[PDB]
Amino acid sequence: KKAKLGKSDLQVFPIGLGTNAVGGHNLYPNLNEETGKELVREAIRNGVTMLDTAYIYGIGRSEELIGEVLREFNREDVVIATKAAHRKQGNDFVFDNSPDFLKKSVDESLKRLNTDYIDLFYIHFPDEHTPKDEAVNALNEMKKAGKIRSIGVSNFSLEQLKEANKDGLVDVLQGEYNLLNREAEKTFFPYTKEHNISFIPYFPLVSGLLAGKYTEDTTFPEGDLRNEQEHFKGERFKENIRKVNKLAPIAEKHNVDIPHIVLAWYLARPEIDILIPGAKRADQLIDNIKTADVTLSQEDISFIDKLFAPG
Ligand code: NA
Numbered sequence: 469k470k471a472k473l474g475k476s477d478l479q480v481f482p483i484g485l486g487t488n489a490v491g492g493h494n495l496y497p498n499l500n501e502e503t504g505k506e507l508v509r510e511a512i513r514n515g516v517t518m519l520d521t522a523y524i525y526g527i528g529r530s531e532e533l534i535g536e537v538l539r540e541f542n543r544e545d546v547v548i549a550t551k552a553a554h555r556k557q558g559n560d561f562v563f564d565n566s567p568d569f570l571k572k573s574v575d576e577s578l579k580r581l582n583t584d585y586i587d588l589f590y591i592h593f594p595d596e597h598t599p600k601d602e603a604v605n606a607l608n609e610m611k612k613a614g615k616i617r618s619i620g621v622s623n624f625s626l627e628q629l630k631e632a633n634k635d636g637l638v639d640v641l642q643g644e645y646n647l648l649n650r651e652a653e654k655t656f657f658p659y660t661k662e663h664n665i666s667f668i669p670y671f672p673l674v675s676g677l678l679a680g681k682y683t684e685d686t687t688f689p690e691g692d693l694r695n696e697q698e699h700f701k702g703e704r705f706k707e708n709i710r711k712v713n714k715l716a717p718i719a720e721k722h723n724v725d726i727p728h729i730v731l732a733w734y735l736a737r738p739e740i741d742i743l744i745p746g747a748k749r750a751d752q753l754i755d756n757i758k759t760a761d762v763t764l765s766q767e768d769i770s771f772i773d774k775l776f777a778p779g
Contacts, residue, residue: 478588485518485753486744487519493529524561553565563594563596586616588617590622600628604633604638620642629659667741672730675697729772
């Protein structure tokens with residue numbers, strides 16, 4: 469019912485909620501803000517502990533909406549993770565990890581969330597010129613003052629992570645990882661496991677491909693982002709569909725669906741304590757809570773590992 473996130477003292481239910489569809493108007497068209505608030509409220513009512521947001525989600529709006537729902541509950545019963553790096557420049561953004569920028573971003577995030585502390589604060593993307601250990605040290609000043617309780621980094625290369633953890637202050641790393649892109653096992657995993665840094669994957673279901681939602685005849689409307697990715701093209705796509713479908717007997721056996729088996733396999737890794745699947749509505753997040761009750765056998769884990777062995 470509760471996992472400890474690496475070196476941090478954060479205790480959380482193993483399925484968290486990603487909030488980029490709660491007020492993220494710069495990312496999605498036609499979003500309903502009350503639908504987003506009900507998603508956050510129902511996640512908390514159903515036992516999800518961690519809410520993962522970011523400044524770029526709606527350019528502050530996701531954090532403001534989450535903050536409004538937070539008023540309805542007890543602050544200490546929830547774990548809030550948020551992130552910063554995007555800095556407005558012209559009509560887009562550039563990344564900034566400078567000490568003063570990160571500290572000011574933490575202050576502005578607390579105001580949007582309308583709360584006095586953040587549980588986990590991430591450097592969302594690495595900038596080019598700031599030495600990463602100084603960027604992390606700036607967040608540690610906020611940790612010392614009680615404004616944040618843990619520090620994370622995301623989208624950092626292994627060398628950037630080592631510089632950032634120079635003094636051992638990084639508690640969590642968010643990075644791309646899934647059954648079709650398992651490169652993190654060779655690079656990051658040995659390092660995060662050794663240092664007790666919690667690893668949270670992003671893109672765990674490959675835009676639905678690993679959820680067994682498509683067939684080899686599936687096509688997507690023009691302009692659809694899936695059409696651009698190689699996992700979704702030619703014979704590779706058909707090969708991907710055939711392997712995912714071989715997961716159906718394991719899902720039937722555990723009385724869940726294919727995505728629940730894939731997400732449970734990530735949680736069985738010693739390096740991973742929590743998953744943050746996304747959702748647009750309360751009902752979709754509730755379907756992903758089922759994942760937590762799955763107990764894969766060692767034979768299930770080994771079979772999936774070999775079935776999805778790197779090509
Ligand atoms: Na684990």
